[PDB]
């Protein structure tokens, strides 16, 4: 799913990201924008063999299991 700018903002605020750890909502929407272009299906492989996943491009080296990262 490719979110709309304001749509994602609403979704993130609802999930408690606004001001989470001192980071205002705009930071998260900006991050999602340039990391995945608001596309939840975005994937990107890195040279170390890990892959980044989702709207926020979370890395497989230490955050999630994809069954192919050392």
């Amino acid at each position: 799913k490719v979110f709309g700018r304001c749509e994602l903002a609403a979704a993130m605020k609802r999930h408690g990201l606004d001001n989470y750890r001192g980071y205002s909502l705009g930071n998260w929407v900006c991050a999602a924008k340039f990391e995945s272009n608001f596309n939840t299906q975005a994937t990107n492989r890195n040279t170390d063999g890990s892959t980044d996943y989702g709207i926020l491009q979370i890395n497989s080296r230490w955050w999630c299991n994809d069954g192919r990262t050392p």
């Binding site: 799913k1 700018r5 304001c6 994602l8 903002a9 609403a10 979704a11 993130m12 605020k13 999930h15 408690g16 990201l17 606004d18 989470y20 750890r21 980071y23 205002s24 909502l25 705009g26 930071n27 998260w28 929407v29 900006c30 991050a31 924008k33 340039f34 990391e35 939840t40 299906q41 975005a42 994937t43 892959t51 996943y53 989702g54 709207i55 926020l56 491009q57 979370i58 497989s60 080296r61 230490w62 955050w63 999630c64 299991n65 994809d66 990262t69 050392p70």
Partner: protein, 58 residues
């Protein structure tokens, strides 16, 4: 390979961002904050980020 968020990566591709949000909350609390996201640090940090929610009904 560590699985600190305890979830299959495929779960982070869902149209429901609950999984991604919960894991991101763990990442940002880790220590380097949002600097953990390369694009944020190079394209968001130090800019008028309020602009990204302007015109929205929050």
């Amino acid at each position: 390979s560590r699985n600190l968020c305890n979830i299959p990566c495929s779960a982070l591709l869902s149209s429901d961002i609950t999984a991604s949000v919960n894991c991101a909350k763990k990442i940002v609390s880790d220590g380097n904050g949002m600097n953990a996201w390369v694009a944020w640090r190079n394209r968001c940090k130090g800019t008028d980020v309020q602009a990204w929610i302007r015109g929205c009904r929050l």
